[PDB]
Ligand binder design. Structure first.
Ligand SMILES: COc1ccc2nc(C)c(O[C@@H]3C[C@H]4C(=O)N[C@]5(C(=O)NS(=O)(=O)C6(C)CC6)C[C@H]5/C=C\CCCCC[C@H](NC(=O)O[C@H](C5CCCC5)C(F)(F)F)C(=O)N4C3)nc2c1
Ligand SMILES: [Zn+2]
Length: 197
């Protein structure tokens, strides 16, 4: 039992900047710093914004702050801690049945407001700062107005679906594809987050 390894923390490595007129990705930590922070769980970098780019040793994806919780997908984070200025922080929400986890939102982040608009005209934010129009098609599904290869959506699980007013409608979970083309997306609705809380 002496030689058993511990899994590393999820690390914030950047963010999707939605502040101004143009959305763009920003990197805040390179691979070497990410690997070290994952092992120690100590991340002293200042955190800003609503959508974080996160990484483990083996995967990279997104995490989104809604209502003071940084939310992401279980298939990316598993049960891992997240790195913080004072060490690894345990998940406050874990739900494998929803493909959902969450931690307390980091100091300095900004939280999205849960949408109460009832609008079906949505916008998916990807890790490459693409803002993709999506028509809501059900409680947990939306169709892309312009389909595209699934490669463009890989790595964007945990990102937000937003309403026209910039409220959070859901967390991107899975892509619905035909012959490698993404025609629709599946997401965790914000109401399911609000219930989990
Ligand atoms: C282990 O414990 C758990 C518990 C609960 C889980 N729950 C789900 C739904 C799940 O699904 C996995 C992961 C997810 C994915 O790949 N997510 C995105 C992503 O980017 N991930 S990621 O960041 O790269 C990264 C892996 C690093 C974190 C957005 C995807 C982008 C491109 C798709 C690539 C091909 C893949 C198409 C596939 N499609 C699909 O499954 O469609 C649906 C079917 C759904 C259920 C079945 C349905 F119903 F939607 F059709 C798909 O999307 N995924 C397969 N794993 C679970 C695992
Ligand atoms: Zn709204």
């Amino acid at each position: 039992m002496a030689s058993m390894k511990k899994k590393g923390s999820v690390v914030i490595v950047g963010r999707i900047n939605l502040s101004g007129d143009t959305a763009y990705a920003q990197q805040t930590r390179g691979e070497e710093g990410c690997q070290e922070t994952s092992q120690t769980g100590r991340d002293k970098n200042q955190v800003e914004g609503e959508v974080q780019i996160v990484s483990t040793a083996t995967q990279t994806f997104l995490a989104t702050s809604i209502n003071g919780v940084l939310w992401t997908v279980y298939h990316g984070a598993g049960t891992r801690t997240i790195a913080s200025p004072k060490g690894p922080v345990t998940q406050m929400y874990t739900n494998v049945d929803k493909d959902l986890v969450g931690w307390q939102a980091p100091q300095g982040s900004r939280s999205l407001t849960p949408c109460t608009c009832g609008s079906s005209d949505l916008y998916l934010v990807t890790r490459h700062a693409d803002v993709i129009p999506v028509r809501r098609r059900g409680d947990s599904r939306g169709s892309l107005l312009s389909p595209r290869p699934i490669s463009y959506l890989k790595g964007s699980s945990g990102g937000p679906l937003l309403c026209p007013a910039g409220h959070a409608v859901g967390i991107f979970r899975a892509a619905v594809s035909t012959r490698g083309v993404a025609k629709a997306v599946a997401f965790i609705p914000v109401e399911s987050l609000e219930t989990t809380m």
